[PDB]
Structures are given as C-alpha cells and as structure tokens.
C-alpha cells in the first residue's frame, strides 16, 4: 500500500515536471522567433 | 509571458510539494522494511 | 508484478524527459551564443 | 532547428504515451490492493 | 526491498531533473530580459 | 552563465548515473519476479 501510494506520488511529480518542460519549450520558441 | 511566469511559479511550487511528500513516504516505506 | 511493471514505466518516462531537457539546453545555448 | 523541432515533437509524444500507460497501470495496481 | 530501493532511485532522479529544469528556467529568463 | 554551464554539466552527469543505477535495479527486480 505504501509502495502503491509512492508510485502515485512519483507519477504526479513526473506529470508536473512535464508541464514545466512544455513551458520551457514554449519560451524557447518565442525567443528563437524573435532572435531569428 | 506574464501568464508564463505565473505558470512557472505554480508548477514549481507543486513539484516541490510532491517531492516533499514523496520524501516523507520514502522514509516511511524504508522504516516499514524492518 | 504490476508494481515492477509500473516502475519500468516511470523510469522510461524519466528517461524520455531527460532527452527533452537536453534538447532545451541545446536550444538555450544556441540562443545565448547568438546574443551574449 | 528543424531537427530540434522534430525531436521535440517526437519526445513529447512519447512522454505523453508513457504517462498514459503509467496512469492505467496505477489504476490497476490500486484495484489489486483490495 | 529492491522495489523500495528502486523508488529511491527514481525519486532521486526526479530531484536531479528538477534542478536541471530550474536552471533552464533561469536561462530562459536571462535571455528574455535581453532579447526583449 | 559560466556557472550555469558548470551546473548543467554537473546535473546532467548525475542524472545519467541515477538512470543507470535505476536501469540496473530494474533488471534485478525483474529477475526476482521469477
């Protein structure tokens, strides 16, 4: 049970990190557009 | 860009919380191994 | 069995996220070189 | 940058897929606890 | 035991990935400040 | 930026190592299922 709960915790962290990554990608594309 | 900064701040806080919780759960699962 | 499978899933996601991260790093490096 | 763009797309899709199947497996593991 | 250890492994990887993300955010902010 | 590049390098190496260790442990856990 503790292990299954922990897996949920990890999965949620991975999901939140994915949102962050997608935000960094958007940012890079914005800059790239203005810089080139 | 203003929204971008808002979301960055929001997800960063969320991750810090999740990492925190996971840390607590790791300790307790580690304890339980004994 | 289900737990081990799930761990494989999570590790794979972490690996894929790492590749994305390396791509963002590359992008940032290209941009700063054009600038600073 | 054209290739960067292709790889960004490719890894983003893969990640979305892995997250999807992890979610399914999570549900399954949760049911099995009962 | 191996399962719990693997969870530690994964969590540590997620933590390290987070440091990396934070660094990419810093970089993007620096660029945006200049390039705009 | 000079420090940024150093930190990127440092964290990338660590992640690589953690991933490797996890890969090893995954394969151990997999054989143990039998």
UniProtKB/TrEMBL annotation, chains A, C, E:
Where does it mainly reside?
Answer: host cell
Q: What start and end residues bound the annotated signal peptide?
A: none
Please, which domain of life does this record's source organism belong to?
Answer: Viruses
Q: What fragment of the whole protein does this chain represent? A: 2 to 37 of 134
Give me the gene this protein comes from.
env
Q: Where is it found, in Gene Ontology cellular component terms?
A: host cell plasma membrane; viral envelope; virion membrane
User: Which terms in the Gene Ontology molecular function aspect does this entry carry?
Assistant: structural molecule activity
Designated name of the protein: Env polyprotein
* A single BP term in Gene Ontology: membrane fusion involved in viral entry into host cell
